[PDB]
Design a protein around this ligand. Structure first.
Ligand SMILES: Nc1nc2c(ncn2[C@@H]2O[C@H](COP(=O)(O)OP(=O)(O)OP(=O)(O)O)[C@@H](O)[C@H]2O)c(=O)[nH]1
Ligand SMILES: [Mg+2]
Ligand SMILES: [Mg+2]
Ligand SMILES: [Mg+2]
Lengths: 46, 49, 104, 282, 350, 51, 49, 14, 360
RNA sequence: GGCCCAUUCGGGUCUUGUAAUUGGAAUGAGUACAAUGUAAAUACCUUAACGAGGAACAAUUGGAGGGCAAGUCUGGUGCCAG
């Protein structure tokens, strides 16, 4: 019984952890990447 | 090597077989095991053919 | 100019985003959220390595500088354009080399 | 683009300074250095030129008026006690760091600088002494430069470092002390996180209020009722009794009674809003 | 009458209705250049409010609310002070009174990010006395230095890392996070020697009343019968009942061959069957990685230099190095643990 | 075992006395070379770079 | 005096801790434990993970 | 799992 | 030792104030002279909630049950479930947590189960639209109470999920010296396990009283039905007066009993809402103890809150005496310079509270 | 054995390497009896005595790569990959 509980908890924690890192990585790329590409366009305009 | 101390890149010395088990022989390490596994598979591959 | 005409921008360390990342010295661990003082705009910046992450803590001044990548690397997080060069008025490299101590 | 950069240097962490708008307490000046570097002679020299009166014996806090609106408290840190160096380093607004020029930096001098750096760096002034013991001008100039650059590593580059040559009648060169006494009055102090969040005071006087009869009928072993006096610092202390306090090196206690007293050394500018005459020592 | 009733008292419905046929009574209701200056303006603006409100108060009312302000010369009276303080009172030694916030009063487990000081010669050790300077207070504690193991657990270390920070947990009065501190091993003049004395530097990260530091505890057994993948192990467990607990546990050899504990063998006691991904050898050693809880020792020895006559020879718990020398005991050593050079003969197969 | 035990203790005590010899007779304590130059952590550099 | 009484109690704690640091560690604290080293049936107690 | 990380607890003497 | 209290009055506040201040308290003589002495079931359940959210605390209940000794620990929070006894609804357990949730080591994610409404305790929609907005003005940006199932009395069966994602050092200093202008009136009329017509019949009743007003009146009809409708039939309304200028809210609520006319309750609550507005200056009475406590636990700053002389009642006076016995802060009250009305400004200095549990 | 060219396979050339030991000579930074220097003095130039093997009389700054564990983490189609 303890074996069943431990494995389920480990999988859930592993699933949640991968969800968080994917979220914070994607949000950084999307929002900051926009600002970078925006700035790169202004510099090209100059 | 960028932003790494020399202390970080320190050789980790590797152990030996216990004295109580000294009769049996050399304590195999991962590199030693890899040589065995490849050798067996090479022979088994030809024997299968 | 990314900083509104300046080469370096003073900021406030709001949070260390990647503190919970399991993999040591990952690209995410070296990221810190910084609030630019000049306009209050929140931005994310790189730290040179996880070792220098210990020095950086919340609510301390940081001087930022552009982070230039010569070539694409597998693990980089594109979009983070800034790297921390000074914390509390002391060079972070100097702290990393133990040639100074951060004054609080 | 220098105009942009200079503006950046003005930008800092917003912070709240709890110094009252009127009648601030005296600033604490800590004279810290290894034994025999001349902490006592420096205090006497500074006390005389600001007050024009000489203290033959100095012990514990000494409050003097250094300016029209500026008041100063001196403290001689015991050089041989490390426990002392810790708790001065937490309250000292200004530290006069004594260094022996002939011998150079010492372990205790470094240790206090590292203690101070971790508890919030206060203003630190380097005072170089025993420069008369040198026999050559050439070696003296090199030692001064070497001492100055090392001191610039611990404290911001360009930090002011004072040079004292010799001692006459237990006093330093008069013209040299004046440059120091101004720089203490010119100094503008910084808001530090810990000092602006807790109340503390340097006991100016100590007195035992325990009744002598109690001492006899029970014995000296009986605990004592004590009163302490001193200016308050930092955040206001609550008026009501019962607040918890810690006395460094003694333990924790609760304020049994508290009462404000007239200032023994009121600043002159205060009296006038109501000069050699104006300068006072307590 | 009492706030346990969230709903407030109201008049009877009909009277409220008559009051509110007509609702005429209630009809009456229905640039700073830089962001830094804006924050400073907000601070200064609020600080202006305090002076205005206090000025409107009576002087007695001011003292009642704000208390005694800085700059006030004040007489504070204490009771139950130790008699040594008045007797062994040296005017040269300062007396610093420090007010305490409610957090400082509590005692518990303090979590700090701690490093050996760069100029300190030796690395600190776990469960090794250290005199700390937190807030207004100085005291001696027994810290435990730990590591995150890729942020999965709180594993106990043996010593501070040579040139980097490591999480430390020690028992003592609590303090707010962002409270820096320093540590010293020796405060007496007798043991000052010549070496640099500031031992540790760090910042408190978290305060708690409990902690679950854990230590890696590795069970070791040896094989005595090997059958291709399957193999029998011995010396890991002392009785079959122990094996019953660990059935299905993951194990590995030194060689890196992973395996599982399948079942306990009836004869002899403690032997069991394990299946490995590949054939193991007799020279190999099987290891079960297990974790054992560790507890922070509750030792609190506040430094009381002023109370002592010397005031400069305070001595508390001694290091593990010094205690051994006094009792003439040797540094414990394990012959198998030591490292030796090993020469590998070239491997050849039939 | 006692004979070897006494040997280890004696060797340790000799080292502590040798360390004690380093402390200067004058009470004044000087900063060592590490504090004075403050070179910190540096890579190993070939002597050829010196000139 | 009260302070002297407190000093005595701390002087009892200090001695106990001094022996503990000198004394050989429990089997659990020692890494790499074996069947012979530990007491019999100890694992049944510890409730390891 | 509830008892793992608690030092307090309700003490009911009724 | 212990700051001693008497009786059961302000039981939740005295524990919460003790937990916030960290000062141990002792409360004695709880229902001494009654036939049934000592703590009620809902009170002891309330205590158990504290240890689920605090760590290291020592609560000791005397043998007779009339005296309790509380030594507060550190707010730890976390995810948990609490089964609220039928003697009190979930709101009786929710509201004290709102004082503590922004001051935790980990976000509060508490699932309450039991009755979701009563005649004397805060309702779900009072907490959602009536108390949280007060916190939002105090700097708790993220707070929510999710209604998964409603449970009407006497059988209940409801469950609500309290989530406070916002953790802050201390509440922002308050400055409200004006009388907010009400832009609109909204509210939630709900029913369970009955015909939907009842909700409309209330909305007719409330609309009848409020139509004299010159502001919009839009009341939502939240009919609950199906598995999520609880186990007993019930219905009630809550009307909230909103001031969009500065996000201020006043509200009044009530639920319906067997044999009661839906139109009449809609008339009564809307009548009471106007009464509360008449009695309000910046925050209504049922909001005030939250506002008073939060200003006490602010920075070392002077907070100004305008209050009406009608608000300063026996409930107000007893609150302030309780605050001083723990915190020792005194609230000074000054009249306003205006002559059109009779308000007074409450000035309070925060004790410099800081959220020291949160890891950084 | 060292080095050079070459995607590939390979091709070209010869006193090279030491992570070894060792000798006596030379001199400046420095420290200084001096003199010169200068209103006096510092500095410079000159010069009695001392001043080199880790010549510890201990210049830096930046980059490119390796390799190691009964170590930790992640994903899988065992023994793999990151
Ligand atoms: N020649 C010379 N003597 C000095 C100098 N500074 C201090 N002294 C001497 O050093 C001695 C020490 O004087 P003190 O005033 O007692 O120094 P201190 O700071 O009080 O030392 P503590 O005993 O620890 O308090 C006196 O004889 C001083 O004349 C200096 O620059 N040159
Ligand atoms: Mg002296
Ligand atoms: Mg320099
Ligand atoms: Mg040679």
């Amino acid at each position: 019984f303890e074996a069943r509980q431990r494995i389920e908890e480990k999988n859930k924690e592993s699933s949640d952890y991968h969800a968080k890192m994917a979220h914070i990585v994607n949000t950084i790329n999307t929002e900051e990447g926009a600002e970078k590409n925006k700035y790169e366009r202004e510099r090209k305009l100059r | 090597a960028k932003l790494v101390h020399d202390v970080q890149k320190k050789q980790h010395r590797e152990r030996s077989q216990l004295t109580s088990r000294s009769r049996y022989g050399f304590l195999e390490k991962h590199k030693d095991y890899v040589k065995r596994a490849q050798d067996f598979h090479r022979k088994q591959s030809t024997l299968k053919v | 100019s990314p900083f509104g005409g300046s080469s370096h921008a003073k900021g406030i360390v709001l949070e260390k985003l990647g503190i919970e990342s399991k993999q040591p010295n990952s690209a995410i661990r070296k990221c810190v959220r910084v609030q630019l003082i000049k306009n209050g705009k929140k931005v994310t910046a790189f730290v040179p390595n996880d070792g220098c992450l210990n020095f950086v803590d919340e609510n301390d001044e940081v001087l930022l500088a552009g982070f230039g990548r010569k070539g694409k690397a597998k693990g980089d997080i594109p979009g983070v354009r800034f790297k921390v060069v000074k914390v509390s008025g002391v060079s972070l490299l100097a702290l990393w080399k133990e040639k100074k101590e951060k004054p609080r | 683009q220098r105009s942009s950069d200079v503006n950046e240097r003005k930008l800092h962490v917003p912070m709240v300074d709890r110094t009252p708008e009127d009648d601030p307490p005296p600033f604490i000046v800590a004279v810290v250095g290894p034994p025999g570097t001349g902490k006592t002679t420096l205090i006497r020299s500074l006390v005389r030129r600001m007050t024009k009166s000489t203290l033959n014996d100095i012990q514990g806090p000494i409050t003097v008026v250094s300016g029209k609106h500026r008041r100063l408290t001196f403290l001689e840190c015991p050089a041989d006690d490390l426990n002392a160096m810790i708790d001065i380093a937490k309250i000292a607004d200004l530290v006069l760091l004594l260094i022996d020029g002939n011998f150079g930096f010492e372990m205790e001098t470094m240790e206090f600088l590292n203690i101070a750096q971790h508890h919030g760096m206060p203003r630190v002034l380097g005072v170089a002494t025993h420069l008369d013991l040198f026999k050559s001008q050439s070696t003296l100039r090199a030692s001064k430069k070497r001492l100055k650059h090392r001191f610039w590593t611990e404290v911001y580059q360009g930090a002011k470092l004072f040079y004292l040559s010799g001692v006459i009648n237990g006093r330093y060169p008069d013209r040299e002390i004046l440059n120091l006494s101004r720089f203490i009055s010119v100094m503008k102090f910084r808001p530090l996180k810990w000092r602006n969040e807790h109340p503390y005071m340097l006991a100016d006087r100590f007195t035992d209020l325990t009744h002598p009869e109690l001492i006899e009928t029970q014995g000296l072993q009986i605990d004592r009722k004590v009163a302490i006096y001193g200016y308050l610092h930092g955040t206001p202390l609550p008026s009501a009794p019962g607040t918890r306090v810690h006395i460094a090196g003694v333990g924790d206690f609760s304020v049994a009674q508290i009462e404000k007293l007239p200032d023994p050394c009121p600043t002159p500018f205060y009296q006038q809003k109501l000069d050699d005459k104006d300068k006072l020592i307590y | 009458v009492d706030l346990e009733k969230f709903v407030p008292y109201f008049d009877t419905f009909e009277k409220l209705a008559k009051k509110w046929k007509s609702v005429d009574a209630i009809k009456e209701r229905f640039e700073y250049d830089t962001w830094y200056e804006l924050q400073k303006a907000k601070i200064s603006k609020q600080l202006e409010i305090n002076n205005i409100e206090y000025q409107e108060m009576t002087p007695e009312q001011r003292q009642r609310i704000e208390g005694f302000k800085a700059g006030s010369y004040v007489r504070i009276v204490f009771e139950k002070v130790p008699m040594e303080f008045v007797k062994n009172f040296n005017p040269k030694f300062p007396i610093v009174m420090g007010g305490l916030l409610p957090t400082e009063i509590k005692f518990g487990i303090v979590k700090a990010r701690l490093r050996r000081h760069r100029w300190h010669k030796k690395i600190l050790k776990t469960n090794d006395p250290l005199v700390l300077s937190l807030g207004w207070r100085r005291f001696q504690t027994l810290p435990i230095y730990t590591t995150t193991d890729s942020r999965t657990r709180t594993r106990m270390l043996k010593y501070t890392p040579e040139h980097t920070y490591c999480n430390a947990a020690f028992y003592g009065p609590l303090c707010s996070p962002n409270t820096p501190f320093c540590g010293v091993q020796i405060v007496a003049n007798s043991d000052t020697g010549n070496g640099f004395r500031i031992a540790a530097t760090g910042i408190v990260e978290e305060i708690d009343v409990n902690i679950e530091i854990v230590k890696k505890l590795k069970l070791v057994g040896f094989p005595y019968k090997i059958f291709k993948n399957t193999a029998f192990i011995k010396d890991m467990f002392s009785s079959a009942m122990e094996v019953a607990r660990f059935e299905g546990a993951q194990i590995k050899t030194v060689s890196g061959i992973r395996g599982e504990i399948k079942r306990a063998l009836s004869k002899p006691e403690g032997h069991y069957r394990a299946a490995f991904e590949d054939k193991i050898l007799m020279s190999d050693i099987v290891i079960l990685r297990s974790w054992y809880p560790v507890r922070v020792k509750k030792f609190y020895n506040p430094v009381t230099s002023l109370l002592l006559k010397e005031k400069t020879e305070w001595k508390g718990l001694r290091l593990t190095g010094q205690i051994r020398a006094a009792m003439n005991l040797e540094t414990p050593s394990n012959p198998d643990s030591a490292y030796h050079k090993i020469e590998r003969v070239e491997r050849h197969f039939n | 075992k006692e004979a070897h035990k006494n040997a280890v203790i004696a060797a340790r005590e000799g080292k502590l006395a040798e360390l004690a010899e380093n402390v200067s007779g004058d009470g004044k304590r000087a900063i060592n070379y590490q504090i004075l130059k403050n070179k910190g952590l540096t890579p190993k550099r070939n002597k050829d770079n010196r000139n | 005096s009260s302070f002297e009484k407190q000093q005595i109690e701390i002087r009892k704690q200090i001695e106990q801790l001094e022996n503990e640091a000198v004394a050989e560690k429990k089997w659990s604290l020692k890494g790499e434990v074996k069947a012979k080293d530990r007491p019999e049936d100890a694992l049944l107690t510890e409730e390891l993970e | 799992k509830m008892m793992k990380n608690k030092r307090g607890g309700v003490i009911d003497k009724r | 030792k212990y700051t001693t209290f008497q009786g059961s009055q302000n039981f939740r506040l005295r524990i919460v104030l003790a937990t916030l201040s960290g000062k141990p308290i002792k409360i004695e003589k709880i229902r001494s002279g009654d036939l049934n002495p000592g703590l009620k079931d809902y009170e002891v359940s309330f205590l158990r909630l504290i240890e689920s959210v605090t760590n290291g605390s020592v609560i000791e209940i005397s043998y007779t049950g009339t005296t309790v000794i509380y030594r507060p620990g550190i707010i730890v929070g976390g995810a948990s479930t609490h089964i609220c006894p039928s003697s009190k609804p979930v709101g009786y357990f929710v509201e004290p947590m709102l004082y503590l949730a922004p001051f935790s080591k980990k976000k509060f994610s508490i699932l309450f189960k039991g009755i979701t409404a009563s005649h004397n305790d805060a309702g779900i929609e009072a907490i959602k639209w009536g108390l949280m907005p007060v916190m939002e003005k105090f700097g708790v940006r993220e707070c929510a109470l999710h209604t998964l199932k409603r449970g009407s009395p006497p059988l209940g069966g409801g469950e609500v999920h309290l989530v406070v994602d916002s953790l802050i050092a201390q509440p922002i200093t308050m400055h409200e010296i004006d009388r907010p202008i009400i832009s609109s009136i909204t509210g939630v009329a709900y029913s369970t396990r009955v015909s939907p017509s009842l909700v409309n019949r209330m909305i007719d009743g409330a609309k009848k009283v409020l139509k004299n007003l010159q502001c919009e009146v839009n009341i939502t009809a939240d009919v609950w039905r199906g598995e999520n409708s609880g186990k007993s039939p019930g219905w009630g309304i809550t009307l909230v007066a909103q001031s969009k200028q500065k996000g201020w809210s006043y509200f009044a609520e009530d639920i319906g009993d067997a044999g009661s006319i839906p139109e009449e309750l809609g008339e009564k609550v809307a009548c009471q809402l106007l009464e509360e507005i008449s009695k309000s200056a910046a925050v209504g009475r049922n909001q005030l103890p939250l506002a008073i406590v939060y200003m006490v636990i602010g920075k070392e700053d002077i907070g100004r809150l305008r209050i009406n002389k009608e608000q300063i009642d026996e409930r107000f006076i007893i609150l302030l005496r309780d605050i001083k016995k723990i915190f020792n802060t005194e609230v000074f009250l000054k009249p306003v310079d205006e002559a059109d009305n009779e308000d007074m400004i409450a000035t309070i200095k925060g004790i410099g509270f800081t959220n020291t549990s949160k890891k950084i």
